[PDB]
Amino acid sequence: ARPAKPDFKTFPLDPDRAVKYVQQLCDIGPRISGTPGMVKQQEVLTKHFEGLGAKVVRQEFKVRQRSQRGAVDMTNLIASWFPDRKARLIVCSHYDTRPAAHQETDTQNWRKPFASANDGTAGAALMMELAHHMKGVPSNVGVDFVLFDGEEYILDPGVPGLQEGDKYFFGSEHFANGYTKAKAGLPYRYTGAVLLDLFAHDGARLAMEGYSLRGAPNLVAELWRVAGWVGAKSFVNERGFDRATDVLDDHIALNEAGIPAVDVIDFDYKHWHLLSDTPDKISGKQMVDVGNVLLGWIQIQK
Ligand SMILES: [Cl-]
């Protein structure tokens, strides 16, 4: 041997394989909280992550959704990489699917299966792709892939203005509360989290929403800086979306627990909560770009 910007590289993420994982998860059928499709998804993901070197842990809990009396079983899944680390990052996504495509204006269409391809599913699929590479990634931080159950187990969507409807965010609230309770006894701390939501469509506009900006200014700066360096053109230095300036999502509970957390989202996704939110709406190149931004963010941590 002889001797030969923060140091990081892109990885050979496979865009076709990433889309195939979206298709595979959607081919389960709906993965509504508390259903056999969700159980099947958990098995698929657990086997995939373990086979690529991650340690997989379940966070099992029960809740009562507002419109129901029965309890629903919920399970967050955590696939952990690099255990011997005092600082850990989170890459997260929900993975339950909404019971109905509630943006359909013909309510008969609320009785049809909602595939939710770009909504939770694509984040899980990007984690499946990233898992092929993680054991080859140099990282000064731990990395936990966290899949939240029960983000939108919405059986009653309410009436806009008149009724709030069902509750969101069971899984992220459970995870964040568990961290708050355990933190003083843990040998690590979570120093940042990136939530992936509505991010994988062709030409996505991944803009800056307010809870992310307020909760995690340096995380936003690092992620968008990495995006500039890797050429991920979807990450734009602009505020908000047509649909909303500030977006409630799974990152709220994380920020409230003191974990800076950014939502990587295009809330103007045109197939949001429509039956047309299907795997053909996913861009493999967009998935690869977001994956490379996440891996660059991981690698630049001191
Ligand atoms: Cl390690």
Ligand SMILES: [Cl-]
């Ligand atoms: Cl909706």
Ligand SMILES: [Cl-]
């Ligand atoms: Cl920050």
Ligand SMILES: [Zn+2]
């Ligand atoms: Zn949704």
